[PDB]
Amino acid sequence: VXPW
Amino acid sequence: DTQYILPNDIGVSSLDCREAFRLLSPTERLYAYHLSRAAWYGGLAVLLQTSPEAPYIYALLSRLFRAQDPDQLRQHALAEGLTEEEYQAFLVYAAGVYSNMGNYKSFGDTKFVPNLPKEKLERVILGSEAAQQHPEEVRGLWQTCGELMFSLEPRLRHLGLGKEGITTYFSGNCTMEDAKLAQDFLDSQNLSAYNTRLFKEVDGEGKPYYEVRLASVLGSEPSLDSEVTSKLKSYEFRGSPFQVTRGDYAPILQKVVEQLEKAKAYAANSHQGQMLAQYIESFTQGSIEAHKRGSRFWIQDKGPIVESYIGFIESYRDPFGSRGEFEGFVAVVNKAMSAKFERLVASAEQLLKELPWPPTFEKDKFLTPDFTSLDVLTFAGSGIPAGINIPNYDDLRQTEGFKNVSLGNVLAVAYATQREKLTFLEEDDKDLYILWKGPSFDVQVGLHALLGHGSGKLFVQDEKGAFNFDQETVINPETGEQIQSWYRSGETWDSKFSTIASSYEECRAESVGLYLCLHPQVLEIFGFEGADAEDVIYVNWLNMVRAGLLALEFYTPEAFNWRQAHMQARFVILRVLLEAGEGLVTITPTTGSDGRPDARVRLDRSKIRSVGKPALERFLRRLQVLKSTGDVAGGRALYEGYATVTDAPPECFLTLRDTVLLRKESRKLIVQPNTRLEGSDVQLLEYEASAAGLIRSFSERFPEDGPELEEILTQLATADARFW
Ligand SMILES: [K+]
Ligand SMILES: [Mg+2]
Ligand SMILES: [Zn+2]
């Protein structure tokens, strides 16, 4: 799993 | 309107990684070169996983820009009557298509079209140099993809199952019912959806036949024996015919495995070599199991200088939530920035104990997980994240361990903001925001990756009832009773929690981040003692509530659907903190300095611990209990209840959404470098931080076989054309  | 176009002054940042590359040894450089080539090759498949016209648009753009670079093409376009702003809009559009590997935003799942008249762009394309060199190919590509490149018909605006959306993970005639039946079949067959797509056709009667196509180099022909070759047959499932095939994106993955084999020669240790062999197996046969074994060997490779991962990893853009989009990154460790995260790992096992659920709902043994800060050289696919927790195989995450990764040169590209663009904050808040955003983000990302995704025990039952926990002694804190819900064989987190799984897990991880950020030991791990940890905490929470407001841009009210997992998660956290009342967070609509509707977010620093922490603790316990029991019913109840967007007073979120859109800022595109092999050495090629720079980065990206990749994509597109 993992914004700006 | 502007919702479905990229603005001509969209920010473009260049990935900064000359120093990390210059650190690398010659062997490490050739290793990263071949891995980057494999990743770039595989990222082309995202085009096929995005929209039916995306491969054609890519082929057309890359042909156009091979014939003429942006500056050559400008002269033609302006001689053909375009304006500089229209040509700039075309450049921005091409750069968007390149940066997303498709004509839909990877962050938002919305289509974007070129911001200029279609007839003028036709004048440009048909008069171009590539058109004069290949009239048949260019004219065919244009007639095939042009109006779809521009059409904003309402069913084309968003990615999604059914008729009101667009997806190529399924055929056009597929609905959520078809995806649910496919997922039940896949669970019954212990075949993971990650590297699969689903196509539905009908016979003369109208009876639906289902094809579950696996992504593989090899097709449906006799190859060396695998667990995959037995599965290539027809089945009947609840009266429906299913056909498991493979050979999807076959020549693309062929290039990928070529480059992976070449990288295998320059591997540092046997862990990397075996993980690469297993990746080759996974991509050639179609085995998610081979990818699992490669990921196991990869977890075993601790602290390498060139970190990497590749495959059909994340399941964000599958409208059902189980199939994986292709990605692949190559990065260099940054030991100085990784120091703080290894520090966070040092006290991580003892940090988990503070989480608001009993150790019976926590992983059995804490495995010392690798956590590095990385500098990216390549991140192929549709988007570059800030950090990753991988692998997503929860069995591996519970037995062997996992890796946490913080992309440093991506965090740095995203750190910069201007005062004007910081919307919905009062001037007193903006200064603390500017001063503390970066360090607060280090904190939040560390907590999100290590203690968020890295925490949680899923209760799995065997086929012989062998619970991985103690059914007799483990008690459910929300009911006081023993455990009654759990996962079975073949059932995974994505499998049971389909459309909300990504957003739900993300919400849990970032609630963990917000919660454990009050812990002063954590704040001193990042070197923030009480003199400044105060402000880093307040900034983390203010950023969270502001993100919860801003998330309304990523909500389709007509479909009652959330288009982005993290933003839905942050809206959920905002509604949760609004729920406790007591004047903690307050969204108040105002009128802006420019005379347009604005809003203001007020967050009280004092009530963060007295009001915010109890609500977050309650919420985290609910989330974790429902996740560990796999209670899809109650989990959906909770999450889809908080994620509900309503115009109810006082918040009036639906009216706020118009303000959030009317003051939205487009996410910047990121230019990535290329690597070249001068026979002996490896050199790094950087590019201007512009639309033309990104275009050039993709024109020089495939020097050996670019025109062949264009035709591979065109062929794979035309073959499946009947599905949409
Ligand atoms: K998912
Ligand atoms: Mg659809
Ligand atoms: Zn995450």
Author numbering:
A (entry chain F): 1 to 4
B (entry chain A): 3 to 726
What's the paper's own text on this?
Dipeptidyl peptidase III (DPP3) is a ubiquitously expressed Zn‐dependent protease, which plays an important role in regulating endogenous peptide hormones, such as enkephalins or angiotensins. DPP3 cleaves the first two amino acids at the N‐terminus of biologically important oligopeptides ranging from 3–10 amino acids. DPP3 has two big lobe‐like domains mostly composed of α‐helices with a smaller β‐sheet portion in the lower domain. Upon ligand binding, the lobes close encapsulating the substrate completely.
Not discouraged by the lack of precedence, we proposed for our DPP3 inhibitor design to incorporate a hydroxyethylene moiety instead of the cleavable peptide bond, as a noncleavable isostere resembling the transition state in peptide bond hydrolysis. We were fortunate to crystallize a SHE/hDPP3 (E451A‐variant) complex and determine its structure with X‐ray crystallography. The binding mode of SHE can be almost perfectly aligned with the binding mode of tynorphin in the previously obtained structure of tynorphin‐hDPP3 complex, the main differences being around the catalytic zinc‐complex. The C‐terminal part of the ligand is bound in a cation‐π complex of the indole moiety of SHE with Lys670 and Arg669 of hDPP3. Arg669 also forms a salt bridge to the carboxylate group of SHE. The equivalence to the tynorphin‐hDPP3 complex is also apparent at the N‐terminus of SHE, which is also tightly bound by the same three hydrogen bonds (Glu316, Asn394, Asn391) and the salt bridge to the Glu316. In contrast to the binding mode of tynorphin, the hydroxyethylene group in SHE does not interact with His568, which most probably presents a significant penalty to the enthalpy of binding. On the other hand, based on the initial rough model of binding of (S)‐hydroxyethylene type of inhibitor, the hydroxyl substituent complexes as expected to the zinc ion, which was confirmed by measurement of the bond length from the crystallographic data. The Zn−O bond was found to be 1.9 Å, which falls into the range of 1.9–2.4 Å for values typically observed for the length of Zn−O coordinating bonds in literature. Another interesting feature is a water molecule hydrogen bonded to the hydroxyethylene, which occupies the space where normally the carboxylate from Glu451 would be positioned within the active hDPP3.
